[PDB]
Amino acid sequence: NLTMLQIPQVTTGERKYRSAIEDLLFNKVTIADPGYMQGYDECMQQGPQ
């Protein structure tokens, strides 16, 4: 059984880029989003955190 090591296929929508085990691993680590697209505006709309 190699289900968790494979990327789940989706019939309609956007293709996924994470496997089940990768999703489990990434959800256990807290990483801040470094505002690649609109970080400058978001830091003003969100306020000091």
Ligand X SMILES: *[C@@H]1O[C@H](CO)[C@@H](O[C@@H]2O[C@H](CO)[C@@H](O[C@@H]3O[C@H](CO[C@H]4O[C@H](CO[C@H]5O[C@H](CO)[C@@H](O)[C@H](O)[C@@H]5O)[C@@H](O)[C@H](O[C@H]5O[C@H](CO)[C@@H](O)[C@H](O)[C@@H]5O[C@H]5O[C@H](CO)[C@@H](O)[C@H](O)[C@@H]5O)[C@@H]4O)[C@@H](O)[C@H](O[C@H]4O[C@H](CO)[C@@H](O)[C@H](O)[C@@H]4O[C@@H]4O[C@H](CO)[C@@H](O)[C@H](O)[C@H]4NC(C)=O)[C@@H]3O)[C@H](O)[C@H]2NC(C)=O)[C@H](O)[C@H]1NC(C)=O
Ligand Y SMILES: *[C@@H]1O[C@H](CO)[C@@H](O[C@@H]2O[C@H](CO)[C@@H](O)[C@H](O)[C@H]2NC(C)=O)[C@H](O)[C@H]1NC(C)=O
CA–CA distances in Å: residue 39 to residues 25, 35, 49: 25, 4, 14
Residue 20 binds to ligand Y (criterion: CB under 6 A): yes
Residue 37 binds to ligand X (criterion: CB under 6 A): yes
Residue 40 binds to ligand X (criterion: CB under 6 A): no
Do residues 25 and 16 touch, judged by C-beta distance below 8 A?
Answer: no
Do residues 19 and 5 touch, judged by C-beta distance below 8 A?
Answer: yes
Q: Of these partners, ligand Y, ligand X, none, which one is at the site of residue 7 (CB under 5 to 8 Å by kind)?
A: none
Segment lying near ligand Y (by CB under 6 A), choices 1-9, 11-19, 23-31, 37-45: 1-9
Query: In the complex, which residues of this chain contact ligand Y (CB under 6 A)?
Result: 1, 3-4, 20
